[PDB]
Amino acid sequence: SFVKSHIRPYMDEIVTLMREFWVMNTSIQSTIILLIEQIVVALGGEFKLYLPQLIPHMLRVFMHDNSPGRIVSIKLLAAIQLFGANLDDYLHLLLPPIVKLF
Amino acid sequence: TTPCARLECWIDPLSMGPQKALETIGANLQKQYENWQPRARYKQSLDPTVDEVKKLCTSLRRNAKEERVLFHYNGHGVPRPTVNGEVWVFNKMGSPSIFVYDCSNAGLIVKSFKQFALQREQELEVAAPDLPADLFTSCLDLLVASLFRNFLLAERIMRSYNCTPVSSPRLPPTYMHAMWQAWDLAVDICLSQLPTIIEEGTAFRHSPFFAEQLTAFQVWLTMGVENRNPPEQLPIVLQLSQVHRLRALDLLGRFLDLGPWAVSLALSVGIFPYVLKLLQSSARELRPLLVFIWAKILAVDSSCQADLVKDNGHKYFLSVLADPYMPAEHRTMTAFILAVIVNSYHTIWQNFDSARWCGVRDSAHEKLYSLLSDPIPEVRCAAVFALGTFVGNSAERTDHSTTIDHNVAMMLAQLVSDGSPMVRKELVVALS
Amino acid sequence: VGRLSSMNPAFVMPFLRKMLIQILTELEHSGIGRIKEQSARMLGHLVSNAPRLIRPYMEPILKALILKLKDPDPDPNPGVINNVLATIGELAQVSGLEMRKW
């Protein structure tokens, strides 16, 4: 909700921390998977400085497509949200599980 | 003209006010425009009226001369300022070109045109009438300024940013800024063509010539960094489109890293691969490394010709394509740059072989009246036979021959001099 | 032999872009390793992409790719000069070994 709010001026700035703190928090935890995901949605709709902020977590993403669990619900959460994570590098890392997820 | 045409300018500080050095930036444009030229009317902050005036001044400013005309804009806090009328009542060889800088309205503005045009197209008819053509509106964080504004100036300047920005600059390192002037003489000459590849890549057939137009149209493609924002700022144009793609785009990337070394220190280089490495296997396909391709290349060759270069090996590789003709000979004339450049040098000896080989086979293409090029060949082409050599000139001399038998622009007296030299070697060759 | 036609590298490359299966790529690298130096025109940059594609793969978790970094690392080295003009693969990899234990 706060993420939902500002867009940017607070975004460019304080945010990077919490991204450490998603890293800090959860690898991700099963529930917080669903959360951070849907949170990164809130994130994902704002920056374009995701791009630098990317891959502390774009790492953990592939905890998940490899991990995985629960009906693929987690996946299709992240899976979709990635279509919000857009875009333009790192398909390097993106496609391989995805295609393996056909 | 010199500089080309009439141009418009605007800036949004807010509404009806000057500003420190806001004055100053305007000229920089006209400068930059002169760096690309022309009669440019600067403005600042105006309420709509003050603007409306000088439009009519340029609407008065006589562009039947100009080769085009421009309408610039910029960011004010969303100045609505004649969505339609002033625009649309000033509406569709001094060809108008419109320019937009918006958060949203850009397309809307463009959308508006057609819509307003839809009126100002159709609704004119029953009055039996504004015809949209040659009137175009081009569309538009930490380090920007105004991108799509800077974009066209600044063409390479902006480029250096998307260099430093970001992940690649790990490899080429490192950054600083500026300096590096006369080695940069090439980067333009390169980035000049580096786009035009994609152009000939994508053109089909809407295209150049007319200069400053394409000069934009080129610099347009610099918008593919667009990368900034998930609204990667997506300029819209309807006179396209790939951006992205266009391997030359991926190519200029390490064509930069070719420059990122020498800039570190001391320059020194100098050199760099690009034009060369592009030049080489242009023969490959030229020989038999292409199935129709579509030449894959020739666009590159054009600007490549202009320099001392490599000029021969190009002009060499030129005739190669002239050998692969007739089929691609048109494509040559599609590019036509021979007509540009081959005629552009009437200034050959060693080149006379290619000047034959390229130019003859060019001249062979049957045809375009040489016009003053006929006096130039009356100089150049005539003086070729001086050595009486080679058979490399055998029919090559006869290139210009039928021109006089084609139509009469004398072709008599300037031919009379040749009339002496022609029949002279005729029996001396004695070869059918 | 003969290898050239401008189409072909554009047809050669995509298999480097497979990557699947890994070792398939591992050929064309060397498979172009020569052809690299015929015309880097297509290649050198098509190449330069690859490391620029590849180098980022040092961060992303582990591994099965980070080894699928390894074999493609040298396999271009039959391409010489590019590798020369960069050699930041040092710094990347120099670190790659140090920090442990992953």
> How far is CA B256 from each of CA B64, B144, B218, B408, C81, rounded to the nearest angstrom?
41, 20, 18, 53, 16
CA C12 from centre of chain:
13
Cα B332 from Cα B296, distance rounded (Å): 12
User: What's chain A's Rg over C-alpha atoms?
Assistant: 13
**Short-list B231, B243, B247, B258, CA closest to B163:** B258
E strands, B103-156, in order: 136-138
Contact pairs from chain A to chain B, CB under 8 Å: 17
> Looking at CA atoms only, how far is residue C88 from chain A in angstroms?
19
Checking chain C for breaks where C and the next N are over 2.5 Å apart, the residues before them are none
**Which residue in the set C39, C49, C51 is minimally distant from B281, CB to CB?**
C39
At B368, which amino acid appears? L
**Which residue in the set C20, C56, C61 is minimally distant from A92, CB to CB?**
C56
**Short-list B195, B202, B246, CA closest to B221:** B195
Q: Cα torsion at A30, A35, A37, A41 (round to 10°)? A: 170
Quick check: C57 and A58 CB within 8 A? Answer: no
Return the residue in A23, A57, A93 with the most chain C beta carbons within 10 A, the one to mutate for interface testing.
Answer: A93
Lookup: tokens for B258: 């070719």
For chain B, say whether C64 makes contact (Cβ under 8 Å).
Answer: no
Q: Cα torsion at B381, B385, B389, B393 (round to 10°)? A: 40
Cα atoms in the 13 Å half-sphere on the side-chain side of A44 = 17
What's the residue count for chain C? 102
What's the residue count for chain B? 432
For chain B, say whether C93 makes contact (Cβ under 8 Å).
Answer: no
With both helix axes pointing from N to C terminus, report the angle between B248-264 and B155-163 in degrees, rounded to the nearest 10.
80
**Short-list B254, B263, B270, CA closest to B163:** B254
Cα A33 from Cα A30, distance rounded (Å): 5
DSSP A88: S
At B198, which amino acid appears? I
For chain C, say whether A99 makes contact (Cβ under 8 Å).
Answer: yes
> How far is CA B14 from each of CA A60, B52, B82, C78, rounded to the nearest angstrom?
46, 17, 16, 60
Given a contact as 3+ CB pairs under 8 Å, which chains touch C?
A, B
Using an 8 Å CB-CB cutoff, list chain A residues near B229: 48
Cα B158 from Cα B187, distance rounded (Å): 13
Alpha helices, DSSP H, located in B240-349: 248-264, 274-280, 282-284, 299-306, 311-322, 329-335, 337, 343-344
Cα B32 from Cα C74, distance rounded (Å): 47
Cα B286 from Cα B324, distance rounded (Å): 7
Quick check: C56 and A58 CB within 8 A? Answer: no
Lookup: tokens for B418: 């040749």
Region label for B56, one of left (φ > 0), alpha (ψ between -120 and 50) or beta (otherwise): alpha
The three-class DSSP label of residue B17 is coil
Please indicate the experimental technique that yielded this structure. cryo-EM
Strand partners, B98: B71, B137
Exposure string for C77-102, b = 16+ CB within 10 A, e = fewer: ebbeebbebbeebeebeeebeeeeee
Quick check: C6 and B254 CB within 8 A? Answer: no
The three-class DSSP label of residue B6 is strand
Cα B363 from Cα B373, distance rounded (Å): 11
Contact pairs from chain A to chain C, CB under 8 Å: 23
For chain B, say whether C56 makes contact (Cβ under 8 Å).
Answer: yes
Return the residue in B170, B190, B254 with the most chain C beta carbons within 10 A, the one to mutate for interface testing.
Answer: B254
Q: Cα torsion at B64, B65, B68, B71 (round to 10°)? A: -80
Using an 8 Å CB-CB cutoff, list chain B residues near A90: none
Chain C residue whose CA is closest to B174: C86
Chain C residue whose CA is closest to A94: C60
Given a contact as 3+ CB pairs under 8 Å, which chains touch A?
B, C
For chain B, say whether A56 makes contact (Cβ under 8 Å).
Answer: no
Lookup: tokens for B152: 């066209």
Tally Cβ neighbours within 10 Å of residue A64. 19
The three-class DSSP label of residue B41 is strand
For chain C, say whether B206 makes contact (Cβ under 8 Å).
Answer: no
DSSP B167-192: SGGGSS-----S---SSHHHHHHHHH
With both helix axes pointing from N to C terminus, report the angle between A57-64 and A73-84 in degrees, rounded to the nearest 10.
150
Q: What are phi and psi of A72, to 5 degrees?
A: 85, 0
DSSP B407: S
CB B34 within 8 A of CB B179: no
For chain B, say whether C17 makes contact (Cβ under 8 Å).
Answer: no
For chain B, say whether C88 makes contact (Cβ under 8 Å).
Answer: yes
User: What's chain C's Rg over C-alpha atoms?
Assistant: 14
